[PDB]
Amino acid sequence: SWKRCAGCGGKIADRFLLYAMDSYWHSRCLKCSSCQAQLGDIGTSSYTKSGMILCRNDYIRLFGNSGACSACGQSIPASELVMRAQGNVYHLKCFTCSTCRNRLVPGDRFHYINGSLFCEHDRPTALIGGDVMVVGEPTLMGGEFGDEDERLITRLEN
Ligand SMILES: [Zn+2]
Ligand SMILES: [Zn+2]
Ligand SMILES: [Zn+2]
Ligand SMILES: [Zn+2]
């Protein structure tokens, strides 16, 4: 007897199919609730939460830890890369020298005084803060997240 698809209720006669969430699927029937991507082709897993079945990217977007830019105040989505300094997060284009306005990039030396950033050549001696810091590589805003909602997809031959 063929298996029935959890997405459409039809018998699955296809040579290749999917298993995920304890169910069988026509690959075309296992789709992201948000973006309609065919989960079994785009990646190796789905996420279940709040009645939805999501791709990784939409799971991050909808449920990942968003932040806010200390410079401009505006929210940052979990998917965006950010610069970090002194426990704050910044949009890449917000991560600038307060004096000359140069954008700071990984490996740069810089100074931080009360939320103000200064490049190596604008050490704010009058304000001084004297600690030289090194700009780190950007990281994702949402950071690492657990896999509690992740459900791997298995590609099967019938
Ligand atoms: Zn189906
Ligand atoms: Zn999606
Ligand atoms: Zn910003
Ligand atoms: Zn500068």
Side-chain angles (χ1 to χ4, degrees):
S1 56
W2 300 126
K3 302 300 183 185
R4 283 185 184 279
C5 177
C8 75
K11 288 186 307 189
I12 301 156
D14 301 359
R15 183 159 178 143
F16 301 101
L17 63 158
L18 306 178
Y19 187 82
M21 291 162 286
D22 303 308
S23 289
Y24 296 88
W25 308 78
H26 296 109
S27 180
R28 58 188 167 84
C29 295
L30 181 56
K31 292 178 289 187
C32 180
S33 304
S34 177
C35 77
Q36 296 71 55
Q38 286 188 358
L39 296 181
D41 298 324
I42 64 151
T44 57
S45 70
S46 64
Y47 289 79
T48 53
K49 186 145 172 89
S50 292
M52 300 176 279
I53 294 170
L54 297 169
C55 71
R56 178 163 296 159
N57 288 337
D58 282 313
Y59 176 77
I60 290 167
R61 181 176 66 82
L62 290 173
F63 299 102
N65 282 321
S66 56
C69 186
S70 281
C72 72
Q74 308 299 280
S75 66
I76 299 159
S79 56
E80 181 174 341
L81 283 176
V82 294
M83 301 303 285
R84 296 208 149 100
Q86 297 284 117
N88 304 137
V89 294
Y90 302 85
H91 293 118
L92 273 65
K93 291 207 165 76
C94 286
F95 198 64
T96 59
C97 178
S98 299
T99 299
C100 78
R101 308 209 57 73
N102 273 22
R103 186 184 315 160
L104 312 172
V105 305
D108 285 353
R109 286 156 164 253
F110 75 112
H111 300 281
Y112 179 93
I113 307 194
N114 277 311
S116 288
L117 297 158
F118 308 90
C119 74
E120 195 193 323
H121 313 289
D122 283 315
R123 178 178 183 278
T125 163
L127 268 179
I128 294 157
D131 290 318
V132 179
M133 278 166 286
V134 179
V135 179
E137 284 296 325
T139 50
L140 294 164
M141 174 70 248
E144 299 181 352
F145 59 97
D147 66 4
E148 63 280 2
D149 292 327
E150 190 177 26
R151 305 287 186 267
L152 298 190
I153 297 162
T154 304
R155 290 159 59 92
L156 300 169
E157 188 168 6
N158 193 327

